[PDB]
Design an enzyme around this catalytic site. Sequence first.
Site, PDB file in Angstrom:
ATOM      1  N   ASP A 181      33.160 -33.041 -25.650  1.00 20.96           N
ATOM      2  CA  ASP A 181      31.727 -33.263 -25.772  1.00 20.96           C
ATOM      3  C   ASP A 181      31.061 -32.866 -24.458  1.00 20.96           C
ATOM      4  O   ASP A 181      30.585 -33.700 -23.691  1.00 20.96           O
ATOM      5  CB  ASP A 181      31.455 -34.726 -26.117  1.00 20.96           C
ATOM      6  CG  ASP A 181      30.024 -34.973 -26.512  1.00 20.96           C
ATOM      7  OD1 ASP A 181      29.253 -34.003 -26.598  1.00 20.96           O
ATOM      8  OD2 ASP A 181      29.667 -36.150 -26.752  1.00 20.96           O
ATOM      9  N   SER A 236      23.217 -40.427 -22.684  1.00 19.20           N
ATOM     10  CA  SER A 236      24.096 -39.311 -23.007  1.00 19.20           C
ATOM     11  C   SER A 236      23.837 -38.136 -22.072  1.00 19.20           C
ATOM     12  O   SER A 236      22.685 -37.835 -21.752  1.00 19.20           O
ATOM     13  CB  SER A 236      23.860 -38.862 -24.436  1.00 19.20           C
ATOM     14  OG  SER A 236      24.690 -39.574 -25.348  1.00 19.20           O
ATOM     15  N   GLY A 237      24.915 -37.476 -21.639  1.00 17.58           N
ATOM     16  CA  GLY A 237      24.804 -36.322 -20.759  1.00 17.58           C
ATOM     17  C   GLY A 237      24.812 -36.644 -19.283  1.00 17.58           C
ATOM     18  O   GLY A 237      25.085 -35.753 -18.473  1.00 17.58           O
ATOM     19  N   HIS A 264      26.706 -32.907 -27.781  1.00 16.12           N
ATOM     20  CA  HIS A 264      25.913 -33.547 -28.821  1.00 16.12           C
ATOM     21  C   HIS A 264      24.448 -33.671 -28.425  1.00 16.12           C
ATOM     22  O   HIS A 264      23.600 -33.893 -29.300  1.00 16.12           O
ATOM     23  CB  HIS A 264      26.494 -34.939 -29.188  1.00 16.12           C
ATOM     24  CG  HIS A 264      26.185 -36.017 -28.194  1.00 16.12           C
ATOM     25  ND1 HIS A 264      27.117 -36.502 -27.304  1.00 16.12           N
ATOM     26  CD2 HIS A 264      25.059 -36.738 -27.983  1.00 16.12           C
ATOM     27  CE1 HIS A 264      26.570 -37.436 -26.553  1.00 16.12           C
ATOM     28  NE2 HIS A 264      25.322 -37.612 -26.954  1.00 16.12           N
TER      29      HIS A 264
END
Lengths: 218, 97
Positions: A88, A173-174, A41
Amino acid sequence: IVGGRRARPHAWPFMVSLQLRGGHFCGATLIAPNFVMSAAHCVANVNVRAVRVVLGAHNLSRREPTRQVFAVQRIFENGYDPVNLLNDIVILQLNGSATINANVQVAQLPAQGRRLGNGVQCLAMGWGLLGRNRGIASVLQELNVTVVTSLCRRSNVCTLVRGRQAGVCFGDSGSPLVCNGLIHGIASFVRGGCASGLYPDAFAPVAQFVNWIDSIIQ
Amino acid sequence: VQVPYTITVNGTSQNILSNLTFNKNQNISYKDLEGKVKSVLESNRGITDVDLRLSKQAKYTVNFKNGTKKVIDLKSGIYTANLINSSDIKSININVD
Ligand SMILES: *[C@@H]1O[C@H](CO[C@@H]2O[C@@H](C)[C@@H](O)[C@@H](O)[C@@H]2O)[C@@H](O[C@@H]2O[C@H](CO)[C@@H](O)[C@H](O)[C@H]2NC(C)=O)[C@H](O)[C@H]1NC(C)=O
Ligand SMILES: *[C@@H]1O[C@H](CO[C@@H]2O[C@@H](C)[C@@H](O)[C@@H](O)[C@@H]2O)[C@@H](O[C@@H]2O[C@H](CO)[C@@H](O)[C@H](O)[C@H]2NC(C)=O)[C@H](O)[C@H]1NC(C)=O
């Protein structure tokens, strides 16, 4: 990272900042000299040609000669489902190989299928927001978290900080979740806002993807 | 910069054409975007937070300059933990019931 602390300089030399014109937007993890791993994402809706992969950073508000910067030459996904937030994970091939040194190092990954039980002690990290309000961190932040299996999904690794409002936030995120020295999670999503104290943070489960990761990075 | 948006309510909206204001190249979160969507729902149609919770469904779709889209459920309380460049947003379509 809400409620964390500053990381010691270059304590986590696999940590990566993904950046666009406006700066850091996602974390990532160096998993080979020419591959980094992040959340799908994080780049689904961005121009991958514009992403800069910043290695060896610590304080994003300073010019750091320890940094190595790469472009993304190719991306690899594995059945990402953006509606259900499943699988994801994305691998980003760099336009070259990092020079490995004290500040830039490759992370170690778990065995395929290793599942962390309830209660395992882990460390989250990232340059995300320092609170529900306030802006992104300058110095890389780290946070002690605990794996939990209630209020989670089998398709995720979830973490909570007991009795505190702490956890990942936007821009995290990530970023990797480090457990027993291995990268077991990639930060994916939060529920009811950052650091609710009630809903665990959700990470993509790296161990479920190791065979695929290995086929790409050889 | 200006970002067009639409609002559809019970399928029977879509009359009104106007824009949102963003800062060029500024990274924002989906909680930021939620607040902008809820603000224009209220100012344009008087659809309040209470109204959204009472609705059968409430979503908005972000259309991006790379041709992709992302559909956000205003009732799910789920947020990806990323930041997004406001300059990459092409338009937003909001749909209540
Ligand atoms: C590999 O790519 C890096 C990064 O390229 C920059 O960022 C990309 C996202 C894209 O915007 C490119 O057009 C950019 O140039 C290259 O690093 C650049 O190298 C040039 C020449 O050495 C230098 O003038 C720039 O300052 C560098 N930019 C950054 C952000 O560091 C690198 O050269 C590429 N590697 C090879 C072998 O070509
Ligand atoms: C907070 O976390 C640090 C970091 O270690 C993490 O926890 C491990 C269980 C494992 O998940 C690692 O991969 C993580 O990085 C803890 O530091 C450790 O502390 C013990 C005892 O003091 C020591 O023997 C280790 O060498 C330390 N390791 C490192 C990397 O510093 C720390 O204890 C945690 N704090 C609390 C209160 O839980």
